[PDB]
Amino acid sequence: PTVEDVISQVARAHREIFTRTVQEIWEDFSMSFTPAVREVVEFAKHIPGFRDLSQHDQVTLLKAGTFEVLMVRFASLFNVKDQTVMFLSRTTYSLQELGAMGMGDLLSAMFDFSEKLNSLALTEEELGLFTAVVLVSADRSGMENSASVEQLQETLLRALRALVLKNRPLETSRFTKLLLKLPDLRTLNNMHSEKLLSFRV
C-alpha cells in the first residue's frame, strides 16, 4: 500500500487497542501485564504486512520484540517528576512501594528512557508508527524468512520518515533520534528480560 495508507492504518489500530502489600502488587501487575501483552499481539495483526509472514515468523517477532514494545507503550506511565509508575488498571505506585519486586534497576532505567522519549513530543500517529517499527526491528535470529521481515521493517520505516518530515520539517534529525532509541531498547531488553516475576500458584 501507499505511505498514507500505512500511517492511517497503524495509527488507527494504535488508538483502538492501546490508548499496597507485595502480594497484592503482583496480582495488580499480573492482571495488567497479561492483557498488555495480548494488546501487542492484536496491534501486530493490524500492521500492514504482518499476517503475510509465516506463523513461525510472526510468533518469533512477537516473542523477541514484545518486551521492547511494552517499554515504549509503558514509557508514558512513568511520572519522572513524582517518581510514580501507573499500571494499566489506573493504580499509581511510588518507586519505593515497587522496590519489593525484583527489578529495581529496570524501574530506574525506565524512568530515564521515558524521559528521553518525552523530549521528542511524539504525536499519537508518530508514537503508533514508532511502536510498529520497534516490534518489527527485534532480533531476526531463528526467522524462516528474514527477507520478508526486513521488507516489512523498511515499509514501516519509510512511512515513519515521511510522517516525521510532514510534522517537523525543520527538525531534520527527528527520524534519526527515533532510530537512536533502538539500541537503547535493545540494551534494556538484554539487561532486563531475564528478571523474575512472581505469580500466586
Binding site: 501485564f33 497479561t34 501483552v37 495480548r38 499481539v41 506463523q55 510468533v59 512477537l62 516473542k63 514484545t66 518486551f67 532486563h192 528480560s193 531475564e194 528478571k195 523474575l196 516475576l197 512472581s198 505469580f199 500466586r200 500458584v201
Partner: peptide, 20 residues
C-alpha cells in the same frame, strides 16, 4: 504458593497460549 518466571518466558507463554 508462588511461581517464579523470567519476563521473556512469561511473554512467550502468553504469546504461544494466544496463538492456539
Amino acid at each position: 504458593t508462588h511461581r517464579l518466571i523470567t519476563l521473556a518466558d512469561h511473554i512467550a507463554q502468553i504469546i504461544t497460549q494466544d496463538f492456539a
